[PDB]
Amino acid sequence: TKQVYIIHGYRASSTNHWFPWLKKRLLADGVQADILNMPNPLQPRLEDWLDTLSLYQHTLHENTYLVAHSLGCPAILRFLEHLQLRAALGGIILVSGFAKSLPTLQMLDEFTQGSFDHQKIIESAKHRAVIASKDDQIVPFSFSKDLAQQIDAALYEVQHGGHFLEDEGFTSLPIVYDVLTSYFSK
Numbered sequence: 001t002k003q004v005y006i007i008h009g010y011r012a013s014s015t016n017h018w019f020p021w022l023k024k025r026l027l028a029d030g031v032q033a034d035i036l037n038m039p040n041p042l043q044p045r046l047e048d049w050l051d052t053l054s055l056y057q058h059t060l061h062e063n064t065y066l067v068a069h070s071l072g073c074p075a076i077l078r079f080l081e082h083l084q085l086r087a088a089l090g091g092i093i094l095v096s097g098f099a100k101s102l103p104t105l106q107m108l109d110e111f112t113q114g115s116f117d118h119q120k121i122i123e124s125a126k127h128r129a130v131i132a133s134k135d136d137q138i139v140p141f142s143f144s145k146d147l148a149q150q151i152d153a154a155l156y157e158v159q160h161g162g163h164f165l166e167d168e169g170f171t172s173l174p175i176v177y178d179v180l181t182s183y184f185s186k
Contacts, residue, residue: 002063002090002184004033005056009070010044010108013037017069017166018173025177038072046111049075057083065090065183067176069164070139073097074111080124081117091127091183093176095164096136098143099150105138121151127183128153131175133161
């Protein structure tokens with residue numbers, strides 16, 4: 001049975017941005033999606049985000065898919081590095097993903113300090129994609145393209161996407177639903 005988990009970033013929760021839209025759009029296809037909240041989204045700590053993800057660890061299988069936004073991206077990358085898996089998850093989609101310090105949000109450096117084991121991430125997710133906005137002023141586009149290269153992920157550029165936030169109009173995001181769905185047909 002397919003399962004999609006949706007993981008938010010800094011200063012967000014399950015009710016923000018495009019997450020409710022994506023959950024409901026998936027439900028229209030009979031696909032179960034759960035938006036996960038992380039602890040202390042205003043002062044996030046990597047170890048606590050990883051401990052929360054670990055609450056779900058026993059449910060992760062070959063038909064599980066993880067969709068993350070912004071800070072949720074390096075969090076799930078760190079999670080997969082330390083996960084013992086019998087087989088790869090179905091896939092990951094990293095919206096505005098990054099794996100190094102964000103100059104305008106250095107308070108979040110602990111989530112990306114240190115190199116990542118790229119091979120383990122590649123082996124942990126059958127299908128991989130990064131969706132990124134060319135005019136993102138929080139996560140520079142180049143950082144998302146860099147990450148896509150490091151983890152051999154398909155990169156989808158949106159020329160004018162801001163940072164895919166509700167205050168920029170992104171209470172929906174069809175590209176994420178369509179990229180995800182293409183994984184299911186494969």
